């Protein structure tokens, strides 16, 4: 069908990600509205409401029933190129798409690099504290 590492790109798959999810009809941040904004529901015990943009990888929790998924997304990751995509997926050119997929994988990389940095830095304090205690 569609390459199973490219479905986050189409709304239906994004909706289909919403398994539990509170907030439905009556609320502004429905599945449909989350998915139109780029969100994927990636739930856990510690937080069963966490949403992630498939494109920029921003993770946002603490959803309020009247949060606008789009505004919520602009006012937390102004960078996201997905916000700029104003064409349907089928209406995308292979270039446009391949361009978008380039920036995506990059984001995936920058996100993983920002993470490695922090873990490193945290390790560096514990080592430094320890050798300090020895002082």
């Amino acid at each position: 069908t569609l390459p199973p590492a490219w479905q986050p790109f189409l709304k239906d798959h994004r909706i289909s990600t919403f398994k539990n999810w509170p907030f439905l009809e009556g609320c502004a941040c429905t599945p449909e509205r989350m998915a139109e904004a780029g969100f994927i529901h990636c739930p856990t015990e510690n937080e069963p409401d966490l949403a992630q943009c498939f494109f920029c990888f921003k993770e946002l929790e603490g959803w309020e029933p009247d949060d606008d998924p789009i505004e919520e997304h602009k006012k937390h990751s102004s960078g996201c190129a997905f916000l700029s995509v104003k064409k349907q997926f089928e209406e995308l050119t292979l270039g446009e798409f391949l361009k978008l997929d380039r920036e995506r994988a990059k984001n995936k990389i920058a996100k993983e690099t920002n993470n490695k940095k922090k873990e490193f830095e945290e390790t560096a304090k514990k080592v430094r504290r320890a050798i300090e205690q020895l002082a």
Partner: peptide
Amino acid sequence: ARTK
């Protein structure tokens, strides 16, 4: 919504 809040940043993790």
